[PDB]
């Protein structure tokens, strides 16, 4: 129903900052993949908008944009024909007159649309530093809103969404005069549709999983983000960010919210967003006593230079490349259950997954059983499985002769499916304004304690698991191997 | 540990009624299979005991017993060497002097045992009509008990265990002066170890299944025993028994007890038997309003003669070949949950299984989900699986695009493993004296109502599902397709 309406009205996608790194390496290639997948509607118009002068727009499309398209050998005809949908407007983000001129250009394309509904839908993409967001949103609101006869406007917001409670709220307050929460889409490129549907459907559609998704049945929950790569020579940019702002306050926290939320009143996006916010509001701010920090030194092989070795890293930096922490959710469903977030650079393997350990049934099987588990993995590939105890056929055939059995419960990438979600009006995986403020309030006191030097990272060789105090902390906070 | 002690002392197996149908067609071939499997200890002595004169015991072993052994082409050397363990005592079941003579014969074999412990273990098997049980048990107690220096005695009791509360209690009272409940083994040939371990381990070893095994989570439970065969020309013997005494009051009820029991204090056999009895005590007697009876007429193909067509069936018999019934378990775990027992001859397929339907999660998935299920099947082959709702990958990728997924949770036959259980001292799958009386009290008021004509069977063509009022009853008592 939603896709039929998508084809019934003109569509324009406006990429601000189209001259930039993100736009050419990620955003336009993602639109190309959606186009090749048949997920953009037939006469979509795509307008790059930036200050950089481009004297030859065809040359820019072919020599700059096209070289970042994947599988170009097999897709040359698609690439050439995708490029015909793309134009370039060289203009200022802060000019009323330029946005009237842009609006004229868009309306001409909209009024030529050969389908049945009038006006047009407009998706604006801010591939810009956040310091430019307020200015460009003001310009859109003044001069490039959809035609009165019809059409929605949506604006995709890039990160960072501030860097603490105060800075993030200032940015939200700067944009809310122009766009409400049905219009702003704050994107996390890494939250895939596959994982979210695994989290939501496997629990809420099923009595068996619904009934055990609580503190009476779950011993501990861990959400883990592991990478073998280090900061890859860009340690200077990472140094002002750190592992926690990088992936934990935003990416792992949204996964936690979807995992822990109460049942939504319906499967509508904003009902799910309401439940994300409601469960995050039950989390007290993380304490320094519940956080172990790491910072990676060079690998034993020598092939991974340590973090401090980077020329761009300020001498004696204490910025964390690794963190494990415990969050307490204080409500009926979760009180007493440890929620462990772990994220690390330059560790022993690449791996992103949820691991839920259920409480052991000590009686009557004793050592012939162990905790059941549920695992939802996204990297290095999708998997979802349950581990349980089953009988062993044959003999001596004692009831105590048991085995651990794995039950397996189980295309655009995550970024492409989120752009598609935005085009289809599905805000589920995007962070809402209230949701964002609650998440910053969970993490900012800890971040202030880190910036004050109250906590300092433990070194770990690149390629190891991380500091061994981290595994100690995990073992002391509910997890059993 | 138990098997090591089995090899440490002499063992004698005494088959009373060894001249009979059961002994030659089933019991001795089952001992042969256990011998071929390595489950009998090396110098086991087997003594057939009966009144029938046998002038040539080697001829009887080779021409009568051996022809019922399975796979005889591939096992000729095993069969010949198994037969050397077998002797025959022609004697009376009611003679003190004969049992002194039998005891002498057994003691000579026991005292020649080359292992470390003295005396010997004695398993007596009553392959006799139950009218002879009290006499032979009296003779054993008087004259053939194990030697004082060491050894247990066990006695396997064949069915029928009475035919109502009063007759069954009279038989129990007749045997209890001679053997207690650690010594009597009342055998149900059809209760396999594989199914029982599936019932017990899958639930009690696992938090996930333990937590949902109750009325808060289960909508209905059905236990089903289906056969395509009819009474096979022996309708006269079946006519005095009926489908309920045949398989429901005994076989399906023990499965129900294992399914519904509370957690046993340990995995010890008598702890499980205690819980079987305790849950059966919570069942009120079955009412005629909760029972649909059937009796099969001839198949449409003609190849299955109807039940009344049998020459041996009394004219105008109302004996049921089919029954569906609802049992109510009135305790905290099960109050309000329908338990449906179904058993039928000459129906559309051969099938024995447990089907547990969990309560639907109406919200939020609505018609995009359905009741989860757990199925434990024994016939026509073992299987155990769970049915749940999962996401469908790809697009349009709506949360409401779901699929029903089957999770698969998964050698002597059932009779052979029960003889082995008896030899190893494991009474789990055998009906205890108190257990039996409670089960007869659940069924006898209904059986009296049937014998009075208060309920009469509905005809159904052989090869169909049974009377359609039966499927109506099932649908009206909690089950949804
Ligand atoms: N892979 C990436 O690059 C990642 C970046 N992001 C976020 O996406 C957004 C874009 O990232 P990225 O492309 O790397 O950033 P850039 O520094 O490359 O800026 C993108 C474009 O924005 C314009 N721009 C830069 N600075 C200013 C300024 N002071 N005033 C006006 N315009 C400016 C420039 O275009 P012009 O001069 O032509 O107007 C520039 O080409 C950022 O918010 C970033 O934090 C998130 C995921 C990863
Ligand atoms: N497949 C089967 O046969 C099934 C039978 N059962 C039960 O197993 C037991 C044996 O069954 P089955 O072999 O068919 O029964 P039978 O009628 O064949 O009797 C078995 C032996 O017991 C002796 N016997 C029979 N009647 C008497 C009597 N009045 N007094 C003394 N001895 C008697 C006879 O041996 P002798 O004259 O040499 O002493 C007979 O050969 C029964 O309890 C039966 O209900 C359960 C499963 C299926």
Numbering used by the authors:
A (entry chain A), B (entry chain A): 62 to 471, 480 to 550
What sentences appear in the manuscript?
The housekeeping enzyme glucose 6-phosphate dehydrogenase (G6PD) (EC 1.1.1.49) is the first and rate-limiting enzyme of the PPP. It catalyzes the oxidation of glucose 6-phosphate (G6P) originating from glycolysis to 6-phospho-D-glucono-1,5-lactone (6PL), whereby the cofactor NADP+ is reduced to NADPH. In the present study, we describe the crystal structures of Leishmania donovani G6PD (LdG6PD), both native and complexed with one or both substrates. The LdG6PD monomer contains three domains: an N-domain (Q5-K49), the NADP+ binding “Rossmann-like” domain (residues D50-I248), and a β + α domain (residues D249-K552).
Crystals containing only NADP(H) diffracted to a resolution up to 1.7 Å, and crystals containing G6P or G6P and NADP(H) to 3.3 Å and 2.5 Å, respectively. The crystal of the truncated mutant LdG6PD60–562 obeyed C222 symmetry with one monomer in the AU and diffracted to 1.9 Å. In contrast to the wt and LdG6PDC138S crystals, which contain the physiological dimer in the AU, the truncation mutant LdG6PD60–562 crystallized in an orthorhombic space group (C222) with one molecule in the AU. Consequently, the physiological dimer is formed by a crystallographic two-fold rotation axis.
